[PDB]
Amino acid sequence: KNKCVNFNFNGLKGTGVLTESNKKFLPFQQFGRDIADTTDAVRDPQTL
Amino acid sequence: GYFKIYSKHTPIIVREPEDLPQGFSALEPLVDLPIGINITRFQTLL
Amino acid sequence: QKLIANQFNSAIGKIQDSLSSTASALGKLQDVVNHNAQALNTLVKQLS
Numbered sequence: 001k002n003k004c005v006n007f008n009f010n011g012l013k014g015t016g017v018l019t020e021s022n023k024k025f026l027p028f029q030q031f032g033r034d035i036a037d038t039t040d041a042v043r044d045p046q047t048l
Numbered sequence: 049g050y051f052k053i054y055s056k057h058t059p060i061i062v063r064e065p066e067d068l069p070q071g072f073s074a075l076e077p078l079v080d081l082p083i084g085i086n087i088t089r090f091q092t093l094l
Numbered sequence: 095q096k097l098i099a100n101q102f103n104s105a106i107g108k109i110q111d112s113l114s115s116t117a118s119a120l121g122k123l124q125d126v127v128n129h130n131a132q133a134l135n136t137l138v139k140q141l142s
């Protein structure tokens with residue numbers, strides 16, 4: 001948390017700062033894309 | 049491939065067979081099952 | 095002198111009335127920002 005780190009979440013790659021969410025996600029979805037295909041929030045697979 | 053199901057439960061008040069009401073309601077998915085079944089018809093169960 | 099001054103004051107006071115109304119008086123300044131936003135929106139929408 002709070003550090004620029006390479007990640008690999010169920011196949012997709014990317015580089016970013018994995019901080020907290022403070023979101024209101026409905027429990028049937030995984031991705032959180034805002035305008036384009038950039039990934040704002042991706043759900044964890046173990047902790048969910 | 050798989051068979052998806054979308055639904056939403058909503059309590060309303062209406063004439064009991066007639067005039068499906070106004071408004072908007074988004075249908076959330078609940079359970080997806082990965083089957084390879086061809087479906088051409090379906091029969092309701094009352 | 096007083097008639098010209100009163101006419102100038104009555105014409106200046108109507109400028110703020112004509113500018114705060116009709117909701118589309120400053121269209122030549124809004125269209126430039128609208129074009130510069132539409133180009134930047136099209137440049138991201140073609141990344142998908």
Ligand SMILES: *[C@@H]1O[C@H](CO)[C@@H](O)[C@H](O)[C@H]1NC(C)=O
Pocket residue numbers: 045046047
């Ligand atoms: C395994 O994944 C599940 C996800 O349902 C999680 O609840 C559990 O804590 C995980 N166990 C370990 C040891 O990571």
